[PDB]
Design a protein around this nucleic acid. Structure first.
Lengths: 76, 52, 58
RNA sequence: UGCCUGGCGGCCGUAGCGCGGUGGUCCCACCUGACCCCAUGCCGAACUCAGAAGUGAAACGCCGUAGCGCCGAUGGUAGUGUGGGGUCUCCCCAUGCGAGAGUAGGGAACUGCCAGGCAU
RNA sequence: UCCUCCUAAAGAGUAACGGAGGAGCACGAAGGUUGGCUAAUCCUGGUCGGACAUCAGGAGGUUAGUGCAAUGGCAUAAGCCAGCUUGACUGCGAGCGUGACGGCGCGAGCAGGUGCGAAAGCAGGUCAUAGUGAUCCGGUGGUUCUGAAUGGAAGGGCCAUCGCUCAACGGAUAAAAGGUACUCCGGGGAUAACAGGCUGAUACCGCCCAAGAGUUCAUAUCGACGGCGGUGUUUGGCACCU
RNA sequence: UGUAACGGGGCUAAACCAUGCACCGAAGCUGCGGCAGCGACGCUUAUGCGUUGUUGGGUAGGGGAGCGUUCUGUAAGCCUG
RNA sequence: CCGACUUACCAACCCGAUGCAAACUGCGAAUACCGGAGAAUGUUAUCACGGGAGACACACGGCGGGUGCUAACGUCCGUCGUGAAGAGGGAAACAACCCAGACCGCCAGCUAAGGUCCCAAAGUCAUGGUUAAGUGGGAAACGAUGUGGGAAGGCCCAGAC
RNA sequence: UUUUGUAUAAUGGGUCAGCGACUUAUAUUCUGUAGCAAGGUUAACCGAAUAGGGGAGCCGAAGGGAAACCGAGUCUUAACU
């Protein structure tokens, strides 16, 4: 046959969920596209990884006219 | 892999050099760029040279 | 303090890990063992979680 | 404090289309002219400047309208965690959660700050 | 060896000689910044012009495009066009992700200097994920770091970098194909051939419906298109016994 | 190869369905007595002793404590014609 | 050149109705997973470091599947239970199924799964039904005035079968 | 004994008695115990001698860096919040 190949898993997914206290610089989700968009206090890395810029609790919300999922770091 | 690698030697007289690749068949002219030279701590002109 | 009596009625040999952990949380150790616990929602949920194998009298 | 207009939001279709009507004192838009500021891989169409003769025609705003899009119960169905059972490819019982689709229905947005014009 | 989807049971991970496809590159602009723009497809009209070139208007709303496979993204466009340029910088890095480890990946911010923009700012390569090779040995450049009595030097170190389809891709060596019925040893029923076991695709023997062959008439005897079993019975499947 | 598709004998219930009350049934649970491990607690600890919970199936394996055998010191001692 | 009509022919796009998808999603659970707070229970059961390992052949059963014939006591994963490494009672016998975890002794008691006519311990127990096949005590498509219960329907003392 | 699993119709043993398998030397790490303690300890050898002498050496109380070198700090870097 010609179907024996496959690639190693990339271990994506949400790494820190909502209402979790995190330190600055910690990865929140590893994604391929921009499935979740960066909100307040969250930056977008080279491979679309959303990372916290300040210490606080993770906040998920749906915003915008396109109903996009935003991740922000609530103040703490 | 027709793209072969070269080195950019600094014009500041120091032995420092960057390294990169180029397609020598479609771009025969030499490469010249301004890059940071950490020995003199200034951005100087680097010129393409033979990788050897 | 409005306590209730819980009595284990069946064995814990083939039960789930979560079920065994629930039984340990209730403090039951063997068949027929009776303990007395406070009547709170947490204790009520643990009883409802393993209701097939425990009997609560009030 | 009432109406209308402009700018920035909250919210992201109960907020969007379509049909009919309506608006120029102010605002906004089309409009007039282009040596100059600036611009067209050609073109003052766009972008830009200097202005107010004309019109709300287009666009845009407001009002009305259920032809759509959209939201949407209650009840039932499917699925399922735990324990048990059968005729065991698949189901049933006790208990907990409970859709999607569809039905009655809802629906022509609501709201905050500032400025201008018209009345009190 | 590496990448994408499913298998994968709604966090991560997850196997088979499972189902499908790709990579061993490319780019001095196809990278960075500032400013601007919106496709695919179809209808109508128009000289050569045609189903399809370029032009004008309309419908449509991303079904298009991304240097390439697939998936996830993308209108503030990551897609397309133009001006200026090298942040495809040097030393670092709070804190995480993924690995048994070697390692791989994301990262605000600090110091020096740079590009675009009036500026807020953005820029440590490319929309992201494949585009790859540890160590030893050796080559080139820089640096008194070291230098076997001393001063040099050779050699070695450090920094930058080169040479392996080492493709059996964590690479036994710089270097390697066959025969044994002339054989031989240590083991395994962990594993095949015989026979036994489970199952019955295949084999054999029945049964359900009845278009038709039988001059007419399905069922005297056969019976197409299809369906349901029995036996263990041929060739098998598995590797449970030796 | 022989009944050989209730384990058998046999059963018109001694089968099946629904309801109810008994009883049998294990090294499960309870009673009585005994041994040992680990934690609370107190004694005046002989550094382990009352009470008190609770534990005690077990291969590869890990930990702890012992019995017995030959020889050396104790030992020209002690037992034995 | 334009064309002419209709022909048991096929047929794009759009509209209405109806299905299918692991590699389809304008919807969408239960579970599972991460984090915070609280009470009770558990011999710290949790984590870090150091000394010593063994193991890297797994098996079956339930649930979710790939592959095979929706074959196999087949094979490969996830998760739980048991065996491995686990005795006792039941399923005749029967590592893996059901009930249940053996420190030791007793000629004591209560129950679980499973049973209560005899082997063989316990109901020839009570009330109301069904079966006539030894069905119970092995199986399908299909065939049949077997038989018990329930709600309707068509013909009928203008006479039903 | 080996196994997922053996009464297994898988291996081994006819039986009895005797013998038969984690030892020894030298280094290294960890645990317990004894001595001394910022110190501990000697090896060959001398010695009539398991005493005593012998401190040659080793480990420790300081590390960072490849190194010169610096030092409770050091390395990177022109320099580090």
């Amino acid at each position: 046959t010609r179907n024996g190949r496959d690639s190693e898993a990339k271990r994506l997914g949400v790494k820190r969920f909502g209402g979790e206290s995190v330190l600055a610089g910690s990865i929140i989700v590893r994604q391929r596209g921009t499935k979740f968009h960066a909100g307040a206090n969250v930056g977008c890395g080279r491979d679309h990884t959303l990372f916290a810029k300040a210490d606080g609790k993770v906040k998920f919300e749906v915003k915008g006219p396109k109903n996009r999922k935003f991740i922000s770091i609530e103040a703490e | 892999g027709i793209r072969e690698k070269i080195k950019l030697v600094s014009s500041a007289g120091t032995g420092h050099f960057y390294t990169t690749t180029k397609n020598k068949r479609t771009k025969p002219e030499k490469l010249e760029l301004k890059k940071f030279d950490p020995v003199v701590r200034q951005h100087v002109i680097y010129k393409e040279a033979k990788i050897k | 303090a409005k306590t209730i009596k819980i009595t284990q009625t069946r064995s814990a040999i083939g039960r789930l890990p979560k079920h065994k952990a629930t039984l340990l949380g209730l403090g039951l150790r063997r068949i027929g063992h009776t303990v007395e616990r406070e009547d709170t929602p947490a204790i009520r949920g643990m009883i409802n979680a393993v209701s097939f194998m425990v009997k609560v009298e009030e």
